């Protein structure tokens, strides 16, 4: 989107969100990133929301088709169309990872921005891992783990236990442990420790920050209820 102003791309990305035009919103934010300037807190959220929606719809479709495909294995069309959706999903994940690698992460010097992008990197490698089956699945899983772990290390050094990004990072890393890494006990332990340390820090927060943190704390509890 090289001929459009950065501010216009950002403004149109907000309009696309309101219109629920998430593919447009992602293309706008991709153009904004490629302007080469760092992203503000709000702009990072727009980037993340745009691609989470796009890849979320692809993941849901992939799961529908993969389930039909496995039932048929109890012509080639079902596998072909699953492969087509799967290829588009991997393309979106590779696109996001390319934005993070060129050059969002290396220019993110603050903990809030660096943890945010590393959380994103873990998420989109996790999405790749969900459909991986061959020689690279283990390497893809380790790339997810490595990204999440570096984000965890920084967030524990640099952010309070109630920080929404720190909480969301831990939530997603615990889903990674349970769903991808076949480590349900690690998943449960991370969610428990994350919830308990946030609980003990709630007294420091304003009413608005209290609302933000307890919302994600509830997601951690929902998983623990499901896992234990």
């Amino acid at each position: 989107m090289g001929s459009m102003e950065r501010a216009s791309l950002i403004q149109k990305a907000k309009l696309a969100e309101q219109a629920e035009r998430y593919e447009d919103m992602a293309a706008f934010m991709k153009g904004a990133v490629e302007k080469g300037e760092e992203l503000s807190c709000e702009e990072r959220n727009l980037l993340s929301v745009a691609y989470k929606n796009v890849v979320g719809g692809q993941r849901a479709a992939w799961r529908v088709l993969s389930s039909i495909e496995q039932k048929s294995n109890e012509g080639p069309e079902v596998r072909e169309y699953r492969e087509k959706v799967e290829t588009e999903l991997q393309g979106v994940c590779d696109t996001v990872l390319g934005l993070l690698d060129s050059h969002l992460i290396k220019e993110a010097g603050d903990a809030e921005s660096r943890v945010f992008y590393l959380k994103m990197k873990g998420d989109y490698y996790r999405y790749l891992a969900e459909v991986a089956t061959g020689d690279d699945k283990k390497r893809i899983i380790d790339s997810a783990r490595s990204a999440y772990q570096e984000a965890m290390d920084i967030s524990k050094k640099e952010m309070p236990p109630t920080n929404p990004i720190r909480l969301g990072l831990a939530l997603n890393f615990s889903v990674f442990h349970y769903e991808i890494a076949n480590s349900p006990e690690e998943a449960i332990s991370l969610a428990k420790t994350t919830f308990d340390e946030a609980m003990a820090d709630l007294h420091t927060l304003s009413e608005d920050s209290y609302k933000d943190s307890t919302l994600i704390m509830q997601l951690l509890r929902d998983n623990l209820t499901l896992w234990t």
């Binding site: 709000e42 727009l46 993340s48 979320g56 969301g168 939530l171 994600i216 997601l219 998983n223």
Partner: peptide, 8 residues
């Protein structure tokens, strides 16, 4: 459940 993260 992961972060829904689909609304800003």
């Amino acid at each position: 459940g992961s972060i829904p993260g689909r609304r800003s």
